[PDB]
Design a protein around this ligand. Structure first.
Ligand SMILES: *[C@@H]1O[C@H](CO)[C@@H](O[C@@H]2O[C@H](CO)[C@@H](O[C@@H]3O[C@H](CO[C@H]4O[C@H](CO)[C@@H](O)[C@H](O[C@H]5O[C@H](CO)[C@@H](O)[C@H](O)[C@@H]5O)[C@@H]4O)[C@@H](O)[C@H](O[C@H]4O[C@H](CO)[C@@H](O)[C@H](O)[C@@H]4O)[C@@H]3O)[C@H](O)[C@H]2NC(C)=O)[C@H](O)[C@H]1NC(C)=O
Ligand SMILES: *[C@@H]1O[C@H](CO)[C@@H](O[C@@H]2O[C@H](CO)[C@@H](O[C@@H]3O[C@H](CO[C@H]4O[C@H](CO)[C@@H](O)[C@H](O)[C@@H]4O)[C@@H](O)[C@H](O[C@H]4O[C@H](CO)[C@@H](O)[C@H](O)[C@@H]4O)[C@@H]3O)[C@H](O)[C@H]2NC(C)=O)[C@H](O)[C@H]1NC(C)=O
Ligand SMILES: *[C@@H]1O[C@H](CO)[C@@H](O[C@@H]2O[C@H](CO)[C@@H](O[C@@H]3O[C@H](CO[C@H]4O[C@H](CO)[C@@H](O)[C@H](O)[C@@H]4O)[C@@H](O)[C@H](O)[C@@H]3O)[C@H](O)[C@H]2NC(C)=O)[C@H](O)[C@H]1NC(C)=O
Ligand SMILES: *[C@@H]1O[C@H](CO)[C@@H](O[C@@H]2O[C@H](CO)[C@@H](O)[C@H](O)[C@H]2NC(C)=O)[C@H](O)[C@H]1NC(C)=O
Ligand SMILES: *[C@@H]1O[C@H](CO)[C@@H](O[C@@H]2O[C@H](CO)[C@@H](O)[C@H](O)[C@H]2NC(C)=O)[C@H](O)[C@H]1NC(C)=O
Ligand SMILES: *[C@@H]1O[C@H](CO)[C@@H](O[C@@H]2O[C@H](CO)[C@@H](O)[C@H](O)[C@H]2NC(C)=O)[C@H](O)[C@H]1NC(C)=O
Ligand SMILES: *[C@@H]1O[C@H](CO)[C@@H](O[C@@H]2O[C@H](CO)[C@@H](O)[C@H](O)[C@H]2NC(C)=O)[C@H](O)[C@H]1NC(C)=O
Ligand SMILES: *[C@@H]1O[C@H](CO)[C@@H](O[C@@H]2O[C@H](CO)[C@@H](O)[C@H](O)[C@H]2NC(C)=O)[C@H](O)[C@H]1NC(C)=O
Ligand code: NAG
Ligand code: NAG
Ligand code: NAG
Ligand code: NAG
Ligand code: NAG
Ligand code: NAG
Ligand code: NAG
Ligand code: NAG
Ligand code: NAG
Lengths: 127, 129, 101, 430, 128, 127
């Protein structure tokens, strides 16, 4: 099936996670007059917001990945939910709300876990 | 749209005649916000009774540039008024064979076929005798 | 300098017949040919421009084709209102005309 | 066989597109060349071996883009300048001690709004119309009028059009390349050569010559309604001068508003004119008449006549010399009939001041008078003929984009599309 | 993927020279060599030589080096990837041993190990 | 040899494929006045067209690659040409014309072949 842009918004986190490229395509293209400056401001805004998400993927060792596995172990303080009660029960919309507070913390952990990982790889290849 | 021409005329051999042709309907409106494309030339043609259609000259209403037919021998002049809404065709030294119905034709502004006369006038019968 | 040979000079057909008129050029003119229809006591009307492009408002029974030197104007299913003189146009030179009856 | 597609990023392939170009250059001139990016001192021209591209100078969008850019820069360079609408008042004019230039006195507004002043100024005939005799500036009943700022220069400065990143420009190295067709030798450049935006009529001035032989270009040369763009290979020199020693006189017409009027002539009153070498113009007309036979016949006779009508801008060699807009009679250059098989020509040029520049009806410009004696030297490197619908060719013009087309034929804008998918016996792992 | 038409059957006599044409179309002429090969009565087929229209380079067998005049014009471009070319061939000391059918052949590829291989042939010309 | 920007435009697909970085460099740098807004519009256009090509490389698992090998098998309907008659006969210009129609189809196949590949890799590392 082909649900469309945000088609799986109401589907479960597991279902939507197979339709990632759907939302990844339309993030950069889409699904001195008044309109002239109004459009230019939007064309620059789209690029800035895109490169910010790409910037975070880059410093997490996830550049080029849609599904990216990391080294940060899941702190149960963030959410003490079982695996089967998340990917087959919740929607990404609900999940983003429940992890609203802890999102900024995870973003830092994913960063130093990458600068230490490549610092280690620089030593693994020092022989 | 049809072009408005002047009424018929009768002239002696050796006299002159002026055929007007209102090709536009403006007065003091033309500047826009975007740069407009060039205008199409106003062509003047005649057809003698029972003869073929004969091209005489075209006249650029923007700057007045003209290209008169060879076989006219400089006996024809084509101008336009200041408002550039009315063309004029003057034929000097009229002879008998100049008796014909004189038309003005213009291509369509949307099209780029300068000779595809989409617009025509009702004709002006000129008789020299 | 160019010479347009239009043939035939006159023809007659019944209501519903297929009528074709040809214009031959003395040398290559690309697709720069226009077809006109002129009735008695009226100014010509543009039928086809650029050899094969039907003008807006002209009934679909008309059609034109040609390139280089051989051109043609066709009236599929002749009607009563089609009685006129048809001639091709190459710049300032016209064909000698065809009187349909 | 075992063939999987593989992705290649950076493949030499392109498409015909049209993008927004930007300028590059090397007092402020009307063409704001100071606002352009500096022309790089190392101009990279890459030659495309084996490549053969189709060109069509008559569809080129660079021309249509340049033409509105100049118009756009012209309008930009007149906003801050003074408006001469208070000059649209009744003039009392007398001849000057034939009858071309006048001597006109009017009541004018001073810097105080309740005081007048009876000032006088000289005006060329072409700038006034009747009603001491009572006259009036030509533009008053059609358009407002704006005095050109006397610090901007009308000097053609070499402008280079550059394409953005990810686009390119394709030159045409073919020494005998006419208008359209497939250019055998092609190269790619980032910007065009130094194009001087010379506004001219009939005679293409100071432009770029043709190598080898003199070329002739046209869409349909069999179509009489298409201007022939003939490009010389050897330049014929033309010398123009207004010899009157004019003087400029400031007239305060308001707070901070000064109209520069023509004061008086200091010395002899003479005619403005242009000289061309009659010998060099004879041999250049011959080179033109030669390539004219290749399209019309070795036996037919080629005749040159002057214009057959129109406005002053198109019936005369219209151009600009040291800041003043000349209008030269050319009947002395196109008066020859050619069969199958010290010298100087002099052209009577008039001078105008109320000029509408392009074809805009609503935006007139007063060119302030230039002090001193004006003389300029320039090459006529091209021509704009028009055959009569014996094949006779007469000069003409008007549409300023033919001027730009005479220098932009060599170029074309293409869009680089570097993603290419092609099969090989390659596959990735698990 | 085009035609390589040749001249007619011009039958002369020993001592003279014969010039055979080969006019190309439907393909970029300068991108492939032009091979010349003959099949005479008395032997089988014999490869004479090829010439590179782009580089102007010529390579021919020692059995015909001092006999063959091999020249090419310059292509007249038709489209971006089409042109029209012409390849010429002459023979010096002509005899009756050289009587046979002669052809021109377009090279196979633009690179690799079979660049000049006679792939696309003409129609043949009958000599003396 | 160093042919220059688009130097191998008339060379064979194999020859040009070794000169990819040549064309890759000058894709982003190059080889309220009138010019001011005219230049700003071009500087934004160059970035948008660049990130679109990078966006496609990213969702094909090719981010960072110049020559990228995939999993989509070559359908002979697209072009029934032999390997040696392509890389040693044709120019990339000719090739882009012959594959004009099928280009949009391949671009989709290269996308889901990557979202299924990483979905599979998420399972390979689930142990
Ligand atoms: C533009 O387009 C033209 C025409 O398509 C291209 O010209 C062709 O280039 C290819 C590759 O560059 C050529 O294929 C190669 O051919 C050589 C054979 O040449 C040898 O023999 C010749 C005759 O004896 C001799 O002249 C050569 O000597 C050198 O000097 C001459 C002087 O004239 C010079 O012009 C030559 O180029 C030579 O450099 C030489 O001794 C052959 O050896 C090659 O095969 C080797 O390499 C390949 C890998 O490439 C390998 O697979 C093989 O196994 C072998 O190792 C190769 O086949 C072709 O002959 C040219 N001409 C054509 C097709 O008509 C040109 O390259 C294009 N340029 C650009 C920039 O796009
Ligand atoms: C365009 O038209 C304008 C007119 O609108 C001309 O301007 C006038 O030009 C004339 C000359 O052509 C000027 O007349 C001269 O004025 C001089 C100034 O003298 C005045 O002031 C003194 C006080 O110091 C008074 O005594 C005197 O009466 C004047 O009122 C005089 O010096 C000149 O005298 C000369 O002529 C007389 C008689 O001909 C001789 O006897 C003298 O010896 C002497 O040679 C002369 O009278 C006039 O002033 C100008 N007007 C203005 C407002 O400036 C432009 O010249 C004209 N330009 C062109 C190019 O055609
Ligand atoms: C075609 O091109 C010609 C040359 O490229 C143009 O000639 C130029 O015309 C302008 C104005 O008409 C001249 O500028 C003037 O210069 C004089 C003084 O110049 C002299 O002094 C300077 C000292 O700085 C010296 O360097 C020069 O060489 C001169 O000796 C000023 O008084 C003026 O105010 C004005 O600035 C150019 O000098 C002149 N160039 C040449 C080489 O003659 C010609 O105008 C062009 N034609 C058209 C129709 O555009
Ligand atoms: C006017 O010019 C056009 C384009 O330059 C000519 O059109 C070409 O004509 C030749 C010969 O008839 C054809 O082989 C081409 O295919 C045509 N190309 C296009 C794009 O139409 C046209 O023939 C010219 N007309 C005249 C009267 O000279
Ligand atoms: C400037 O001189 C010319 C030339 O003498 C004058 O032109 C004359 O104008 C009158 C009208 O008032 C005509 O009747 C004459 O036929 C014209 N003569 C010529 C030779 O054309 C002109 O009037 C003078 N202007 C002023 C302001 O004195
Ligand atoms: C007018 O004449 C020639 C153009 O042919 C120019 O003079 C030559 O300019 C070239 C390059 O600028 C030099 O290599 C020659 O040495 C010059 N010749 C001479 C005799 O000086 C001249 O600059 C042109 N003027 C323009 C285009 O304004
Ligand atoms: C044109 O006229 C001006 C004055 O109207 C002349 O300028 C004078 O030049 C001399 C030097 O030759 C100076 O001593 C004067 O002071 C200048 N006068 C002014 C008012 O500035 C100029 O020489 C004349 N030029 C020509 C070619 O006639
Ligand atoms: C146009 O003007 C130029 C320069 O003002 C003239 O060139 C001069 O010609 C004479 C005679 O041959 C030479 O002695 C000078 O050396 C030349 N000047 C320069 C700067 O080289 C040219 O003759 C004039 N041509 C016309 C047609 O008027
Ligand atoms: C969970 O997070 C808290 C603070 O938010 C931290 O103190 C604790 O060590 C974390 N536990 C694990 C297992 O990471
Ligand atoms: C985040 O902090 C706010 C503080 O007002 C709290 O109300 C909210 O419950 C917190 N989020 C979660 C998921 O506990
Ligand atoms: C200026 O105004 C006065 C007021 O009566 C008038 O007499 C005079 O003729 C005017 N001057 C001009 C040049 O019109
Ligand atoms: C402007 O005045 C001139 C006088 O020369 C007249 O011929 C023309 O018709 C007028 N034009 C307009 C638009 O009023
Ligand atoms: C330019 O040259 C080509 C080939 O020589 C020719 O087909 C074309 O008609 C020429 N252009 C004109 C305007 O004659
Ligand atoms: C052209 O020449 C004729 C006769 O030589 C002349 O009457 C006419 O005024 C001239 N036209 C121009 C614009 O010089
Ligand atoms: C141009 O000059 C000729 C004679 O040299 C003259 O007959 C003609 O009238 C002039 N042009 C104009 C527009 O006056
Ligand atoms: C090739 O493509 C067609 C449709 O374009 C498809 O039906 C067919 O299955 C494809 N074949 C292979 C082997 O991928
Ligand atoms: C692509 O489709 C068009 C449809 O008009 C067709 O003419 C063309 O041949 C197709 N492309 C290929 C490579 O077959």
């Amino acid at each position: 099936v082909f649900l469309g842009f945000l088609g799986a918004a109401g589907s479960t986190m597991g279902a939507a996670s197979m339709t990632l490229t759907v939302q990844a395509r339309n993030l950069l293209s889409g699904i001195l007059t008044v309109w002239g400056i109004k459009q230019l401001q939007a064309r620059v805004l789209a690029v800035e917001r895109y490169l910010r998400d790409q910037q975070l993927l880059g410093i997490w060792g996830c550049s080029g990945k849609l599904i990216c596995c990391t080294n940060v172990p899941w702190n149960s303080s963030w959410s003490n939910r079982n695996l089967s009660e998340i990917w087959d029960n919740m929607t990404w919309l609900q999940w983003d709300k429940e992890i609203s507070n802890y999102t900024q913390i995870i973003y830092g952990l994913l960063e130093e876990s990458q600068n230490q990982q490549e610092k280690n790889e620089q030593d693994l290849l020092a022989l | 749209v049809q072009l408005v021409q002047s009424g018929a005329a009768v002239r002696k051999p050796g006299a002159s005649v002026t055929v007007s042709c209102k090709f536009a309907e403006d007065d003091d409106y033309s500047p826009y916000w975007v740069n407009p494309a060039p205008e199409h030339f106003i062509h003047f043609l005649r057809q003698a009774p029972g003869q073929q259609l004969e091209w005489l000259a075209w006249m650029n209403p923007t700057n007045g540039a003209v290209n008169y037919a060879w076989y006219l021998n400089g006996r024809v002049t084509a101008t336009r008024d200041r408002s550039m809404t009315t063309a004029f065709l003057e034929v000097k030294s009229l002879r008998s064979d100049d008796t014909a119905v004189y038309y003005c034709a213009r291509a369509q502004k949307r099209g780029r076929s300068e000779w595809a006369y989409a617009h025509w006038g009702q004709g002006t019968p000129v008789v020299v005798s | 300098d160019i010479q347009m040979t239009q043939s035939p000079s006159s023809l007659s057909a019944s209501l519903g017949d297929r009528v074709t008129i040809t214009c031959q050029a003395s040398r290559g003119i690309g697709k720069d040919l226009n077809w006109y229809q002129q009735k008695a006591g009226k100014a010509p009307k543009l039928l086809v421009s650029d050899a094969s492009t039907l003008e807006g408002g002209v009934p679909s029974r008309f059609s034109g084709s040609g390139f280089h030197q051989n051109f043609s104007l066709t009236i599929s299913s002749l009607q009563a209102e089609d009685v006129a003189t048809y001639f091709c146009q190459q710049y300032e030179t016209f064909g000698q005309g065809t009187k349909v009856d | 066989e075992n063939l999987w597609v593989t992705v290649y990023y950076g493949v030499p392939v392109w498409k015909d597109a049209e993008t927004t170009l930007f300028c590059a250059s090397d007092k402020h001139n009307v063409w704001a060349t100071h606002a352009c990016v500096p022309t790089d001192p190392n101009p990279q021209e890459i030659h495309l071996e084996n490549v053969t591209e189709e060109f069509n100078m008559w569809k080129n969008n660079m021309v249509e883009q340049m033409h509105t850019d100049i118009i756009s820069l012209w309008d930009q360079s007149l906003k801050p300048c003074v408006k001469l609408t208070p000059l649209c008042v009744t003039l009392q004019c007398t001849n000057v001690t034939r009858g071309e230039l006048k001597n006109c006195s009017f009541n004018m507004t001073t810097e105080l709004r309740d005081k007048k002043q009876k000032v006088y100024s000289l005006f060329y005939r072409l700038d006034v119309v009747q009603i001491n005799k009572e006259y009036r500036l030509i533009n008053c009943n059609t358009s407002a009028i704006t005095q050109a700022c006397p610090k901007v220069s009308f000097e053609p400065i070499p402008i280079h059009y550059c394409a953005p990143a990810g686009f390119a420009i394709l030159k045409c190295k073919d020494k005998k390349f006419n208008g359209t067709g497939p250019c055998p030798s092609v190269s790619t450049v980032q910007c065009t050569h130094g194009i001087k935006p010379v506004v001219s009529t009939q005679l293409l001035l100071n432009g770029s010559l043709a190598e080898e032989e003199v070329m002739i270009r046209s869409e349909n040369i069999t179509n009489n309604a298409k201007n022939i763009l003939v490009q010389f290979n050897t330049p014929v020199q033309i010398n123009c001068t207004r010899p009157n020693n004019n003087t400029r006189k400031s007239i305060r017409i308001g707070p901070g508003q000064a109209f520069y009027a023509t004061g008086d002539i200091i010395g002899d009153i003479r005619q403005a004119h242009c000289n061309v070498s009659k010998a060099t113009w004879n041999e250049t007309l011959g080179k033109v008449v030669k390539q004219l036979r290749k399209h019309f016949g070795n036996n037919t006779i080629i005749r040159f006549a002057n214009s057959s009508g129109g406005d002053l801008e198109v019936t005369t060699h219209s151009f600009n010399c040291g800041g003043e807009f000349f209008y030269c009679n050319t009947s002395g250059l196109f008066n020859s009939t050619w069969i199958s098989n010290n010298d100087s020509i002099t052209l009577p040029c008039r001078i105008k001041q109320i000029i509408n520049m392009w074809q805009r009806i609503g935006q007139a410009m007063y060119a302030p008078p230039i002090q001193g004696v004006i003389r300029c030297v320039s090459n006529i490197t091209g021509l704009i003929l028009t055959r009569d619908g014996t094949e006779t060719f007469r000069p003409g013009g008007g549409d300023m984009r033919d001027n730009w087309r005479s220098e932009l034929y060599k170029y074309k804008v293409v869009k680089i599309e570097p993603l290419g998918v092609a099969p090989t016996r390659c596959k990735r792992r698990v | 993927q085009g035609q390589l038409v040749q001249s007619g059957a011009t039958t002369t006599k020993p001592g003279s020279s014969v010039k055979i044409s080969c006019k190309t179309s439907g393909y970029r002429f300068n991108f492939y060599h032009i091979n010349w090969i003959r099949q005479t009565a008395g032997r089988g087929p014999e490869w004479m030589g090829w010439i590179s229209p782009y580089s102007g380079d010529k390579n021919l067998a020692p059995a015909f080096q001092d006999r063959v005049n091999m020249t090419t014009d310059t292509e007249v471009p038709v489209t971006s990837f089409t042109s029209t070319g012409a390849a010429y061939m002459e023979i010096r000391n002509l005899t009756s041993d050289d009587t046979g059918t002669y052809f021109c052949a377009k090279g196979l590829l633009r690179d690799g190990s079979s660049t000049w291989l006679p792939y696309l042939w003409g129609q043949g010309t009958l000599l003396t």
